Design a protein around this ligand. Sequence first.
Ligand SMILES: [Cl-]
Ligand SMILES: [Cl-]
Lengths: 386, 388
Amino acid sequence: QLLVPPPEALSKPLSVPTRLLLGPGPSNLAPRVLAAGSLRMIGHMQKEMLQIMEEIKQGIQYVFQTRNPLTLVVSGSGHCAMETALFNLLEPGDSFLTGTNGIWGMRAAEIADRIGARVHQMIKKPGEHYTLQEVEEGLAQHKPVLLFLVHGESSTGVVQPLDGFGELCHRYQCLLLVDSVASLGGVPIYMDQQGIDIMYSSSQKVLNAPPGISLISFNDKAKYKVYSRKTKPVSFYTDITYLAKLWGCEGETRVIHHTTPVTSLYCLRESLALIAEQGLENCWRRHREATAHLHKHLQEMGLKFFVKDPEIRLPTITTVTVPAGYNWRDIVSYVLDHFSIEISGGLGPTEERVLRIGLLGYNATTENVDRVAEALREALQHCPKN
Amino acid sequence: MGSYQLLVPPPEALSKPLSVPTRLLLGPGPSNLAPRVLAAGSLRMIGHMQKEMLQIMEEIKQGIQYVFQTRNPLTLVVSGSGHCAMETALFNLLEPGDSFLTGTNGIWGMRAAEIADRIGARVHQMIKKPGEHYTLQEVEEGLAQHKPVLLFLVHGESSTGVVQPLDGFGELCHRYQCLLLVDSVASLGGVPIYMDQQGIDIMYSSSQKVLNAPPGISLISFNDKAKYKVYSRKTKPVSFYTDITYLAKLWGCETRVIHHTTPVTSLYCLRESLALIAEQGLENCWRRHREATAHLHKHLQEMGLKFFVKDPEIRLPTITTVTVPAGYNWRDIVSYVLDHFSIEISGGLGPTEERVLRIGLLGYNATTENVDRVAEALREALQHCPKN
Ligand SMILES: [Cl-]
Ligand SMILES: [Cl-]
């Protein structure tokens, strides 16, 4: 008799409800992504898989607007890629500076502390962005080798201006790493033209692919920092010298490394195809249009924006101050139960303070906005008020 | 819409429809997907912390407890692949200066030693020739010599086709105040393993071998003794996103906490894989693997091919290493099987590179028909590939 019996809970079929996902992520899957969902497996090193990897690389290069050959997929999620960037770029004792204007800069600082960097932070109140003058003051004070800046701050609903920051860093012999997990595909970014040295994003926000994989690109200046290291990075399986060879970024010959997530790659390939077919300008315009419609409905319902400066409101994820007198969990639950729409509360410094509404890629439509606006109106008239 | 003009154009290659060929994957991994797992790949998305996802996660935990044969509450999925889980184990279990002992009998022990060296452990290796396993006596001599806090042992050595006996190793380790960490990536579901009963403190496996799930996620379990080593560290582990103290809370192993976005689709696939094993039952799954392998071995012997592993009792049921026949170019054989029969097999890995062919019979694929298919392909490759 075996110690542990077959779990009764697994004896029933798997079913998932049909919902409209308008939170900060994951987003709903695009039809072409859904169609790729039941493709068969092939060997991860076979010629057809190497071709899919090359197409993905080309797609990443297009969406990032980079020619960097060290552009690839990291086999992990949400912000994970963040560890790949920091483990490779930072050595013990290196001066590291973060734009801590929300949960993401704080998390980067935590990761850098774990690997022994000398971590410095420009701390700003949630809802705020960094000016060039503020960044210059941090660079001059801390003399960092790397600056971490968040483009789309999903915890606070802030979009950071990017023009000029990379060249400012280069004047201080500092590299610029940008997080565009919540912004890529929805907000203009020109990695090379803006002087961004390292950038990462994820599959499950604007790209409408399943969560679990991430996108990263390092320029040759960043690669030079990695090759100048005294020691190997702490992780073998995110070591960019190994990943570069796996992904064919150093010419013809590969190296055996890990088993890549083949079905996730199929989905990402389709997601990138969709963006390439629509074109970035049209993608950027659709997000601006969807968000403008949402902001009009929010103002009409009497909801207030967490971000006071309209010019720094992130198009893709909007932070709404919880309405006075209501329990925000009642609002979220009402929308879920009566309309089958997912929205969220806050994150990090905005926990208990806001609602977050995401309009991401395939989901950034005025029709979806109309649906969540109706749900919120009904929640406001029925949820208990004090 | 922004401050610059787009200078990188849309890639034309992406406009072509994505299709993949239909092949039988009989290599060391990844395996073909079970029908319910293929179907799970097209399920819709839901929020990763919604009630339905938390239920799926609870069912997956129970499934992992079943296949590992453990009652350990600290049992969860690591959101990464192949032998990724290996880093999670080592980053959490080893502090700088900790004595670490590895069973280096193939590529996996070599890899564990390299990862441990990167994080500052005092690494000691028990080096054995590829194709051999460890005796209790050899392990005791290493424990006595090096006084490790942790021993790493590979159950299914996929680079050499070896299955390591596990009875007595945990108890031995515990007599030396050492924790036992086992890699069952290539053996779980195909070879008997009883985690608690065999005194294994930490164990990990992956989704893409016997489980017939897509690559990308791994399974790990830590017992109370291992949990004590982790929760008693002096410094934080190097990775926040594989820190077990945080993953334990995400997975409800204690209150719950926000951490990373879980791979929802991979979890759907894994739930279905675990459901299939639970329906079939472990004993039946072990039997079908022994039965398929016996049939393959009968075919290989009859066609003149020699086993890389000399002792039959040490031959891993799931992945067989065949010595490359004299006079042939192994690449020709592998390409012949692919081109003429649409079957994937492989060559070697690490210390067996250029030395062997590897044939995997994993879960759904461990069938008589599949063995007969690959045997036919191999007989024809031997007839038609150039031989010196
Ligand atoms: Cl969906
Ligand atoms: Cl398949």
